Amino acid sequence: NIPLEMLRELLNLVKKIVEEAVLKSLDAIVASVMEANLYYTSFSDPLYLTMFKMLRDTLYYMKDLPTSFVKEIHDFVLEQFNTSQGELQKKLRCQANAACVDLMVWAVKDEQGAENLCIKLSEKLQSHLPLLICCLQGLGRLCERFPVVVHSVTPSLRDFLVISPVLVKLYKYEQLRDIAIDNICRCLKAGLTVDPVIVEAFLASLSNRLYILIPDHTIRALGHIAVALRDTKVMEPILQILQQKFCSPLDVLIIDQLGCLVITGNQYIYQEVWNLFQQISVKAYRHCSLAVINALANIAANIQDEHLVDELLMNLLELFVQLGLNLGVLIPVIAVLTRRLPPIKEAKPRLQKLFRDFWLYSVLMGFA
């Protein structure tokens, strides 16, 4: 229960300490002391960064604020931003600038103001790195708060992803990419929260873009959105898209995505993916022969439905007994699966027959 006048005097303190003349005087006395003869060298940038960081933090989570206070806060941050940013267009000031960005997005309460903020950030994006990442975070948060401007911000984020010279120069890394796709997923979920038809338009647009090294980014985004909507008319479209998108070293990470897709825990999806893997194994794209079993190695450790566990165990036992008619690589996954279960006492005699056949084949081949 902080009374308001303490906030007012804190604003007075912060506006008094951001004076530049006092900084110049401190620099002059620092020079006098240095020439008179110590850890710090220049106080201006560190003091400014500390003061802006505390300004951002100490007014971060505080709520229940009427109109005059927030409008004057917005005045402070906008005038400081205009004075500061419009001068370095010729180091550590970017952190303070990003603090100003994070503070000013809290002090907005009008949809038109949000639209103006999005327009300015879109203008600055399509051309310091902390400033860009904080701009992306602010765009994501603002889109999360206001569902109206989602269609306004949907293209601005996609055009950068589908087309990034800075990333190309950096390659010759991925944190910005993953935070960007996370913001994309948050924007999509916020949009579909209010409008049940925007997601269909977005998936149609991404399918059209896929039709026309962008496939790697597209596949990663598709995997991220698919795992994002695991709970929720939405799983069937992505299922059919991934079914129809098959077909080239680009197939290495597709099954990697399928391994994560297995986690969702749907009987039909599990049957489809297991049938696809069985067909691939029977045919043996020879290069994928290793990759697929690697996917199994990842699948074996990420199953939580016991029904799926026993079904997978039976399926791989049947696959092993069928392939007997090269076979020494299928044991590690069985060991990993069986190390997660207590010793078995009795079950369906089908399991007993499968185990007996497996041991018979093992002793025939002399693996023991």
Swiss-Prot record:
Coiled coil: none annotated. Expressed ubiquitously. Highest levels in placenta and brain. Little or no expression in lung, liver, pancreas, testis or leukocytes. It comes from the Eukaryota. It is found in: Cytoplasm; Cell membrane. Component of a phosphatidylinositol 4-kinase (PI4K) complex, composed of PI4KA, EFR3 (EFR3A or EFR3B), TTC7 (TTC7A or TTC7B) and HYCC (HYCC1 or HYCC2). Interacts with TMEM150A; regulating recruitment to the plasma membrane. Interacts with TTC7A. (Microbial infection) Interacts with CHKA/Choline Kinase-alpha; CHKA bridges PI4KA and hepatitis C virus (HCV) non-structural protein 5A (NS5A) and potentiates NS5A-stimulated PI4KA activity, which then facilitates the targeting of the ternary complex to the ER for viral replication. Acts on phosphatidylinositol (PtdIns) in the first committed step in the production of the second messenger inositol-1,4,5,-trisphosphate. Belongs to the PI3/PI4-kinase family. Type III PI4K subfamily. It is linked to Neurodevelopmental disorder with spasticity, hypomyelinating leukodystrophy, and brain abnormalities: A severe autosomal recessive disorder characterized by global developmental delay with impaired intellectual development and poor or absent speech, axial hypotonia, and peripheral spasticity and hyperreflexia. Brain imaging shows hypomyelination with decreased white matter volume, cerebral and cerebellar atrophy, and thin corpus callosum. Polymicrogyria may be observed in rare cases. Gastrointestinal defects and immunodeficiency syndrome 2: A severe autosomal recessive disorder characterized by multiple intestinal atresia apparent soon after birth. Affected infants have a distended abdomen, bowel obstruction and do not pass meconium. There is some evidence of inflammatory bowel disease. Death occurs in the first weeks of life. Some patients may also have immunodeficiency. This is Phosphatidylinositol 4-kinase alpha. It comes from Homo sapiens (Human). The lineage of its organism: Eukaryota, Metazoa, Chordata, Craniata, Vertebrata. The chain holds residues 323 to 808 of 2102 of the full protein.
